[PDB]
Design an enzyme around this catalytic site. Structure first.
Site: not given
Ligand SMILES: Nc1nc(=O)c2ncn([C@@H]3O[C@@H]4CO[P@](=O)(S)O[C@H]5[C@@H](O)[C@H](n6cnc7c(N)ncnc76)O[C@@H]5CO[P@@](=O)(S)O[C@@H]3[C@@H]4O)c2[nH]1
Lengths: 195, 195
Positions: B18, B139, B143
Protein backbone atom coordinates in the site's frame (compact mmCIF):
# COMPACT_ATOMS: atom_id res chain seq x y z
CA UNK A 1 15.09 9.97 30.80
CA UNK A 2 14.08 7.98 27.72
CA UNK A 3 16.84 6.23 25.77
CA UNK A 4 16.87 7.97 22.37
CA UNK A 5 18.74 7.00 19.21
CA UNK A 6 18.98 9.57 16.41
CA UNK A 7 20.34 8.54 13.01
CA UNK A 8 23.00 10.85 11.59
CA UNK A 9 21.80 10.15 8.04
CA UNK A 10 18.50 11.87 8.93
CA UNK A 11 20.15 14.92 10.49
CA UNK A 12 20.02 13.60 14.04
CA UNK A 13 23.52 14.56 15.17
CA UNK A 14 23.60 16.14 18.64
CA UNK A 15 26.97 17.13 20.09
CA UNK A 16 25.51 16.88 23.62
CA UNK A 17 24.73 13.17 23.13
CA UNK A 18 27.01 10.18 22.79
CA UNK A 19 28.31 9.98 19.23
CA UNK A 20 29.02 6.76 17.34
CA UNK A 21 29.18 6.01 13.60
CA UNK A 22 25.80 7.13 12.28
CA UNK A 23 24.25 7.44 15.76
CA UNK A 24 23.69 10.09 18.40
CA UNK A 25 22.17 8.48 21.49
CA UNK A 26 21.34 9.39 25.07
CA UNK A 27 23.04 6.21 26.36
CA UNK A 28 26.37 4.65 25.38
CA UNK A 29 25.90 0.93 24.68
CA UNK A 30 28.89 -1.38 24.47
CA UNK A 31 27.95 -3.62 21.53
CA UNK A 32 31.05 -5.83 21.77
CA UNK A 33 29.37 -8.26 24.19
CA UNK A 34 26.53 -9.45 21.91
CA UNK A 35 26.63 -12.53 19.70
CA UNK A 36 22.95 -12.35 18.64
CA UNK A 37 20.71 -9.32 18.05
CA UNK A 38 17.04 -8.98 17.15
CA UNK A 39 15.25 -6.65 14.73
CA UNK A 40 11.43 -6.88 14.87
CA UNK A 41 11.32 -10.26 16.65
CA UNK A 42 13.91 -11.66 14.20
CA UNK A 43 17.24 -12.97 15.51
CA UNK A 44 20.52 -12.60 13.61
CA UNK A 45 24.04 -13.86 14.33
CA UNK A 46 26.98 -11.51 14.89
CA UNK A 47 29.86 -12.28 12.52
CA UNK A 48 32.93 -13.55 14.37
CA UNK A 49 36.40 -12.18 13.54
CA UNK A 50 35.09 -9.94 10.75
CA UNK A 51 34.09 -6.33 11.30
CA UNK A 52 32.87 -3.25 9.42
CA UNK A 53 34.67 0.08 9.37
CA UNK A 54 31.92 2.67 9.77
CA UNK A 55 32.22 6.44 9.91
CA UNK A 56 30.13 9.58 9.78
CA UNK A 57 31.33 13.12 9.05
CA UNK A 58 29.24 15.77 10.84
CA UNK A 59 30.26 19.42 10.94
CA UNK A 60 34.06 19.12 10.86
CA UNK A 61 34.19 16.01 13.08
CA UNK A 62 35.03 12.51 11.84
CA UNK A 63 33.73 9.57 13.89
CA UNK A 64 35.06 6.20 12.71
CA UNK A 65 35.20 2.78 14.32
CA UNK A 66 35.39 -0.95 13.67
CA UNK A 67 31.96 -2.31 14.50
CA UNK A 68 30.34 -5.72 14.96
CA UNK A 69 28.11 -6.84 12.13
CA UNK A 70 25.31 -9.38 11.78
CA UNK A 71 24.08 -11.05 8.60
CA UNK A 72 20.51 -10.56 7.40
CA UNK A 73 19.22 -11.41 3.93
CA UNK A 74 16.15 -9.19 4.33
CA UNK A 75 16.08 -5.44 3.79
CA UNK A 76 16.27 -3.49 7.06
CA UNK A 77 15.67 0.25 7.12
CA UNK A 78 17.96 2.90 8.59
CA UNK A 79 16.57 3.74 12.01
CA UNK A 80 15.11 0.30 12.69
CA UNK A 81 15.66 -0.41 16.40
CA UNK A 82 18.02 -3.26 17.30
CA UNK A 83 17.32 -5.21 20.49
CA UNK A 84 19.15 -7.70 22.65
CA UNK A 85 17.49 -10.87 23.93
CA UNK A 86 16.43 -9.06 27.14
CA UNK A 87 14.21 -6.49 25.39
CA UNK A 88 16.71 -3.62 25.63
CA UNK A 89 17.29 -1.46 22.59
CA UNK A 90 21.05 -1.31 22.02
CA UNK A 91 21.37 0.37 18.60
CA UNK A 92 19.64 1.22 15.31
CA UNK A 93 20.24 0.06 11.76
CA UNK A 94 22.90 2.25 10.17
CA UNK A 95 25.39 0.89 7.64
CA UNK A 96 25.22 -2.09 5.32
CA UNK A 97 27.57 -4.18 3.19
CA UNK A 98 25.54 -6.60 1.06
CA UNK A 99 23.94 -8.98 3.58
CA UNK A 100 25.95 -7.59 6.54
CA UNK A 101 24.56 -4.93 8.89
CA UNK A 102 26.81 -2.95 11.22
CA UNK A 103 25.99 -2.79 14.94
CA UNK A 104 26.90 0.74 15.99
CA UNK A 105 27.83 1.85 19.49
CA UNK A 106 30.92 1.44 21.63
CA UNK A 107 32.74 -1.08 19.46
CA UNK A 108 36.38 -1.88 18.73
CA UNK A 109 39.25 0.22 17.38
CA UNK A 110 38.08 3.78 16.66
CA UNK A 111 39.28 7.04 15.10
CA UNK A 112 38.09 10.61 15.78
CA UNK A 113 39.29 13.62 13.79
CA UNK A 114 38.89 17.36 13.45
CA UNK A 115 38.49 17.52 9.67
CA UNK A 116 39.21 21.26 9.49
CA UNK A 117 42.20 21.81 7.22
CA UNK A 118 42.64 18.11 6.37
CA UNK A 119 40.88 15.55 4.21
CA UNK A 120 40.21 11.86 4.75
CA UNK A 121 39.92 9.03 2.25
CA UNK A 122 38.92 5.37 2.43
CA UNK A 123 40.42 2.48 0.49
CA UNK A 124 39.94 -1.27 0.26
CA UNK A 125 43.38 -2.68 1.06
CA UNK A 126 44.03 -5.46 -1.44
CA UNK A 127 45.36 -8.58 0.26
CA UNK A 128 49.14 -8.87 0.23
CA UNK A 129 49.71 -5.14 -0.27
CA UNK A 130 51.80 -2.95 2.00
CA UNK A 131 50.94 0.67 2.76
CA UNK A 132 53.01 3.85 2.73
CA UNK A 133 51.46 7.29 2.85
CA UNK A 134 48.69 7.62 0.27
CA UNK A 135 49.58 4.57 -1.84
CA UNK A 136 49.40 0.79 -1.53
CA UNK A 137 51.63 -1.68 -3.38
CA UNK A 138 53.77 -4.77 -2.97
CA UNK A 139 56.23 -4.78 -0.07
CA UNK A 140 59.32 -4.16 -2.22
CA UNK A 141 57.88 -1.03 -3.84
CA UNK A 142 56.47 0.37 -0.58
CA UNK A 143 59.76 -0.33 1.18
CA UNK A 144 61.85 1.44 -1.47
CA UNK A 145 59.50 4.44 -1.47
CA UNK A 146 59.67 4.73 2.33
CA UNK A 147 63.46 4.93 2.06
CA UNK A 148 63.18 7.48 -0.76
CA UNK A 149 60.73 9.67 1.16
CA UNK A 150 62.87 9.20 4.29
CA UNK A 151 65.32 11.92 3.21
CA UNK A 152 62.50 14.49 3.06
CA UNK A 153 61.64 16.92 5.83
CA UNK A 154 58.13 16.26 7.21
CA UNK A 155 55.51 18.83 6.30
CA UNK A 156 52.19 19.39 8.06
CA UNK A 157 49.44 16.80 7.74
CA UNK A 158 47.00 17.54 4.93
CA UNK A 159 45.26 14.18 4.37
CA UNK A 160 44.32 11.01 6.20
CA UNK A 161 43.94 7.67 4.46
CA UNK A 162 42.06 4.65 5.81
CA UNK A 163 43.01 1.20 4.53
CA UNK A 164 40.50 -1.59 5.20
CA UNK A 165 41.80 -5.09 4.50
CA UNK A 166 40.54 -8.62 5.05
CA UNK A 167 43.08 -9.18 7.86
CA UNK A 168 44.41 -5.74 8.90
CA UNK A 169 43.32 -2.09 8.93
CA UNK A 170 45.66 0.91 8.86
CA UNK A 171 45.38 4.70 8.96
CA UNK A 172 48.13 6.93 7.56
CA UNK A 173 48.63 10.70 7.48
CA UNK A 174 50.54 12.49 4.73
CA UNK A 175 51.93 15.95 4.06
CA UNK A 176 51.85 17.87 0.78
CA UNK A 177 54.71 15.72 -0.59
CA UNK A 178 52.98 12.40 0.12
CA UNK A 179 55.40 11.61 2.94
CA UNK A 180 53.92 9.45 5.67
CA UNK A 181 53.77 11.49 8.89
CA UNK A 182 51.83 9.01 11.02
CA UNK A 183 50.58 5.42 10.88
CA UNK A 184 48.22 3.36 13.06
CA UNK A 185 47.43 -0.34 12.69
CA UNK A 186 44.31 -2.24 13.76
CA UNK A 187 44.92 -5.99 13.81
CA UNK A 188 41.43 -6.93 12.62
CA UNK A 189 39.90 -7.77 9.26
CA UNK A 190 37.03 -5.62 8.07
CA UNK A 191 34.88 -4.34 5.20
CA UNK A 192 33.58 -0.89 4.19
CA UNK A 193 29.88 0.04 3.90
CA UNK A 194 28.23 0.00 0.48
CA UNK A 195 25.94 3.11 0.15
CA UNK B 1 2.60 -11.11 9.40
CA UNK B 2 3.64 -8.00 11.32
CA UNK B 3 2.52 -4.55 10.16
CA UNK B 4 5.48 -3.02 8.32
CA UNK B 5 6.07 0.64 7.45
CA UNK B 6 8.75 1.80 5.02
CA UNK B 7 9.70 5.44 4.56
CA UNK B 8 9.87 6.50 0.92
CA UNK B 9 12.66 8.95 1.80
CA UNK B 10 14.85 5.98 2.79
CA UNK B 11 14.28 4.09 -0.46
CA UNK B 12 11.49 1.90 0.86
CA UNK B 13 8.93 2.26 -1.91
CA UNK B 14 7.39 -1.09 -2.85
CA UNK B 15 4.74 -1.12 -5.58
CA UNK B 16 3.26 -4.34 -4.17
CA UNK B 17 2.59 -2.62 -0.83
CA UNK B 18 0.00 0.00 0.00
CA UNK B 19 1.34 3.38 -1.08
CA UNK B 20 0.66 6.68 0.69
CA UNK B 21 2.53 10.01 0.76
CA UNK B 22 6.01 9.03 1.93
CA UNK B 23 4.91 5.54 3.05
CA UNK B 24 4.80 2.01 1.68
CA UNK B 25 2.96 -0.23 4.13
CA UNK B 26 1.55 -3.75 4.45
CA UNK B 27 -1.68 -2.31 5.89
CA UNK B 28 -3.88 0.62 4.86
CA UNK B 29 -4.80 2.65 7.94
CA UNK B 30 -7.56 5.27 7.75
CA UNK B 31 -6.04 8.10 9.78
CA UNK B 32 -8.96 10.53 9.55
CA UNK B 33 -10.53 9.16 12.74
CA UNK B 34 -7.76 10.13 15.19
CA UNK B 35 -7.89 13.29 17.28
CA UNK B 36 -4.72 12.46 19.27
CA UNK B 37 -1.53 10.55 18.48
CA UNK B 38 1.57 9.58 20.43
CA UNK B 39 5.27 9.61 19.51
CA UNK B 40 8.04 8.62 21.95
CA UNK B 41 5.40 8.28 24.68
CA UNK B 42 4.25 11.88 24.21
CA UNK B 43 0.64 12.72 23.35
CA UNK B 44 -0.11 15.24 20.59
CA UNK B 45 -3.39 16.72 19.34
CA UNK B 46 -4.54 16.49 15.73
CA UNK B 47 -5.16 19.98 14.38
CA UNK B 48 -8.82 20.62 13.58
CA UNK B 49 -9.87 22.03 10.18
CA UNK B 50 -6.32 22.51 8.88
CA UNK B 51 -4.32 19.88 7.02
CA UNK B 52 -1.03 19.32 5.20
CA UNK B 53 -0.72 18.59 1.49
CA UNK B 54 1.83 15.78 1.34
CA UNK B 55 3.24 14.02 -1.71
CA UNK B 56 6.04 11.69 -2.75
CA UNK B 57 7.28 10.93 -6.26
CA UNK B 58 8.24 7.26 -6.59
CA UNK B 59 8.65 5.11 -9.72
CA UNK B 60 7.47 7.97 -11.98
CA UNK B 61 4.22 7.92 -9.97
CA UNK B 62 2.87 10.88 -8.00
CA UNK B 63 1.07 10.20 -4.70
CA UNK B 64 -0.44 13.25 -3.01
CA UNK B 65 -3.15 13.83 -0.45
CA UNK B 66 -4.41 16.18 2.24
CA UNK B 67 -3.29 14.60 5.49
CA UNK B 68 -4.15 15.21 9.14
CA UNK B 69 -1.38 16.87 11.10
CA UNK B 70 -0.49 17.17 14.78
CA UNK B 71 1.41 19.87 16.65
CA UNK B 72 4.74 18.90 18.22
CA UNK B 73 7.54 21.26 19.24
CA UNK B 74 10.01 18.39 19.73
CA UNK B 75 12.06 16.79 16.97
CA UNK B 76 10.59 13.59 15.53
CA UNK B 77 12.68 11.55 13.11
CA UNK B 78 11.47 10.33 9.69
CA UNK B 79 10.48 6.67 9.87
CA UNK B 80 9.77 6.65 13.60
CA UNK B 81 6.48 4.95 14.56
CA UNK B 82 3.31 6.89 15.33
CA UNK B 83 1.01 5.21 17.84
CA UNK B 84 -2.64 5.45 18.83
CA UNK B 85 -3.87 5.62 22.42
CA UNK B 86 -3.80 1.80 22.62
CA UNK B 87 -0.12 1.47 21.65
CA UNK B 88 -0.67 0.27 18.08
CA UNK B 89 1.50 1.77 15.36
CA UNK B 90 -0.73 3.53 12.82
CA UNK B 91 1.86 5.45 10.75
CA UNK B 92 5.41 6.82 10.68
CA UNK B 93 6.88 10.30 10.76
CA UNK B 94 6.99 11.61 7.20
CA UNK B 95 6.59 15.33 6.55
CA UNK B 96 6.84 18.40 8.74
CA UNK B 97 5.94 22.09 8.60
CA UNK B 98 7.61 23.90 11.51
CA UNK B 99 5.80 22.54 14.59
CA UNK B 100 3.30 20.49 12.54
CA UNK B 101 3.81 16.85 11.51
CA UNK B 102 1.76 14.99 8.93
CA UNK B 103 -0.09 11.76 9.76
CA UNK B 104 0.14 9.78 6.54
CA UNK B 105 -2.15 6.97 5.45
CA UNK B 106 -5.63 6.95 3.95
CA UNK B 107 -6.40 10.64 4.38
CA UNK B 108 -8.77 13.17 2.81
CA UNK B 109 -8.78 14.50 -0.79
CA UNK B 110 -6.03 12.88 -2.85
CA UNK B 111 -4.31 13.19 -6.22
CA UNK B 112 -2.43 10.46 -8.11
CA UNK B 113 -0.46 11.19 -11.27
CA UNK B 114 1.56 9.32 -13.87
CA UNK B 115 4.52 11.71 -14.08
CA UNK B 116 5.93 10.54 -17.43
CA UNK B 117 5.37 13.26 -20.02
CA UNK B 118 3.63 15.60 -17.55
CA UNK B 119 4.98 17.81 -14.79
CA UNK B 120 3.65 18.94 -11.42
CA UNK B 121 4.32 22.08 -9.39
CA UNK B 122 3.33 23.14 -5.89
CA UNK B 123 2.42 26.66 -4.79
CA UNK B 124 1.30 28.47 -1.66
CA UNK B 125 -1.88 30.36 -2.57
CA UNK B 126 -1.38 33.83 -1.11
CA UNK B 127 -4.40 35.12 0.78
CA UNK B 128 -6.70 37.13 -1.46
CA UNK B 129 -5.19 35.86 -4.71
CA UNK B 130 -7.11 34.21 -7.53
CA UNK B 131 -5.77 31.44 -9.75
CA UNK B 132 -5.77 30.86 -13.48
CA UNK B 133 -3.81 27.97 -14.96
CA UNK B 134 -0.24 28.19 -13.71
CA UNK B 135 -0.36 31.73 -12.26
CA UNK B 136 -1.85 33.49 -9.24
CA UNK B 137 -2.51 37.23 -8.89
CA UNK B 138 -5.13 39.59 -7.51
CA UNK B 139 -8.66 39.03 -8.78
CA UNK B 140 -8.50 41.95 -11.23
CA UNK B 141 -5.45 40.60 -13.07
CA UNK B 142 -6.78 37.03 -13.06
CA UNK B 143 -10.13 38.15 -14.49
CA UNK B 144 -8.33 39.79 -17.42
CA UNK B 145 -6.06 36.76 -17.83
CA UNK B 146 -9.04 34.38 -17.92
CA UNK B 147 -10.68 36.48 -20.64
CA UNK B 148 -7.48 36.53 -22.71
CA UNK B 149 -6.90 32.78 -22.43
CA UNK B 150 -10.55 31.99 -23.24
CA UNK B 151 -9.83 32.66 -26.93
CA UNK B 152 -7.15 29.94 -27.06
CA UNK B 153 -7.74 26.52 -28.57
CA UNK B 154 -6.96 23.88 -25.92
CA UNK B 155 -4.10 21.44 -26.26
CA UNK B 156 -3.26 18.28 -24.32
CA UNK B 157 -2.32 18.63 -20.66
CA UNK B 158 1.41 18.78 -19.90
CA UNK B 159 1.54 20.26 -16.40
CA UNK B 160 -0.35 20.13 -13.12
CA UNK B 161 -0.32 22.90 -10.53
CA UNK B 162 -1.28 22.45 -6.88
CA UNK B 163 -2.44 25.56 -5.02
CA UNK B 164 -2.49 25.21 -1.23
CA UNK B 165 -4.14 28.04 0.69
CA UNK B 166 -5.30 28.69 4.24
CA UNK B 167 -8.97 28.36 3.21
CA UNK B 168 -9.04 26.25 0.03
CA UNK B 169 -6.92 23.90 -2.08
CA UNK B 170 -7.10 23.63 -5.86
CA UNK B 171 -5.41 21.70 -8.67
CA UNK B 172 -5.26 23.01 -12.23
CA UNK B 173 -3.95 21.44 -15.43
CA UNK B 174 -2.47 23.48 -18.27
CA UNK B 175 -1.43 22.89 -21.86
CA UNK B 176 1.74 24.10 -23.58
CA UNK B 177 0.28 27.62 -23.90
CA UNK B 178 -0.71 27.72 -20.24
CA UNK B 179 -4.44 27.54 -20.84
CA UNK B 180 -6.36 25.95 -17.97
CA UNK B 181 -7.79 22.62 -19.15
CA UNK B 182 -9.04 21.29 -15.80
CA UNK B 183 -9.59 22.51 -12.26
CA UNK B 184 -10.55 20.64 -9.11
CA UNK B 185 -11.29 22.36 -5.80
CA UNK B 186 -10.91 20.89 -2.31
CA UNK B 187 -12.89 22.76 0.33
CA UNK B 188 -10.22 22.50 3.02
CA UNK B 189 -7.36 24.66 4.27
CA UNK B 190 -3.83 23.30 4.38
CA UNK B 191 -0.11 24.02 4.42
CA UNK B 192 2.80 22.56 2.43
CA UNK B 193 5.71 20.67 4.01
CA UNK B 194 9.02 22.40 4.70
CA UNK B 195 12.01 20.09 3.85
N1 LIG C 1 56.72 -3.27 11.59
C1 LIG C 1 55.41 -3.87 11.44
N2 LIG C 1 54.46 -3.81 12.52
C2 LIG C 1 53.17 -4.40 12.36
O1 LIG C 1 52.40 -4.34 13.25
C3 LIG C 1 52.80 -5.10 11.04
N3 LIG C 1 51.69 -5.72 10.65
C4 LIG C 1 51.89 -6.17 9.38
N4 LIG C 1 53.14 -5.83 8.99
C5 LIG C 1 53.71 -6.12 7.72
O2 LIG C 1 54.89 -6.96 7.84
C6 LIG C 1 55.82 -6.53 6.83
C7 LIG C 1 57.13 -6.14 7.45
O3 LIG C 1 57.03 -4.88 8.05
P1 LIG C 1 58.17 -3.71 7.83
O4 LIG C 1 59.22 -4.51 7.22
S1 LIG C 1 59.02 -3.06 9.68
O5 LIG C 1 57.85 -2.54 6.71
C8 LIG C 1 57.05 -1.36 6.96
C9 LIG C 1 57.81 -0.22 7.49
O6 LIG C 1 59.02 -0.59 8.17
C10 LIG C 1 58.13 0.60 6.28
N5 LIG C 1 58.37 1.96 6.61
C11 LIG C 1 57.47 2.90 6.94
N6 LIG C 1 58.12 4.05 7.18
C12 LIG C 1 59.45 3.84 6.99
C13 LIG C 1 60.61 4.66 7.08
N7 LIG C 1 60.52 6.06 7.46
N8 LIG C 1 61.80 4.12 6.82
C14 LIG C 1 61.90 2.85 6.48
N9 LIG C 1 60.85 2.05 6.38
C15 LIG C 1 59.61 2.54 6.63
O7 LIG C 1 56.97 0.45 5.42
C16 LIG C 1 56.48 -0.88 5.65
C17 LIG C 1 54.98 -0.84 5.77
O8 LIG C 1 54.49 -2.09 5.41
P2 LIG C 1 53.13 -2.62 6.18
O9 LIG C 1 53.21 -2.07 7.53
S2 LIG C 1 51.33 -1.81 5.39
O10 LIG C 1 53.08 -4.25 6.36
C18 LIG C 1 54.16 -4.88 7.06
C19 LIG C 1 55.21 -5.33 6.14
O11 LIG C 1 54.65 -5.72 4.90
C20 LIG C 1 53.71 -5.16 10.02
N10 LIG C 1 55.06 -4.54 10.19
Amino acid sequence: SMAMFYAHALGGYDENLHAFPGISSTVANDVRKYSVVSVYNNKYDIVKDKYMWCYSQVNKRYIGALLPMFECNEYLQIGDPIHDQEGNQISIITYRHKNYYALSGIGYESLDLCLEGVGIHHHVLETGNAVYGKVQHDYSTIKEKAKEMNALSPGPIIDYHVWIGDCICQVTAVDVHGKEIMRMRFKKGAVLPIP
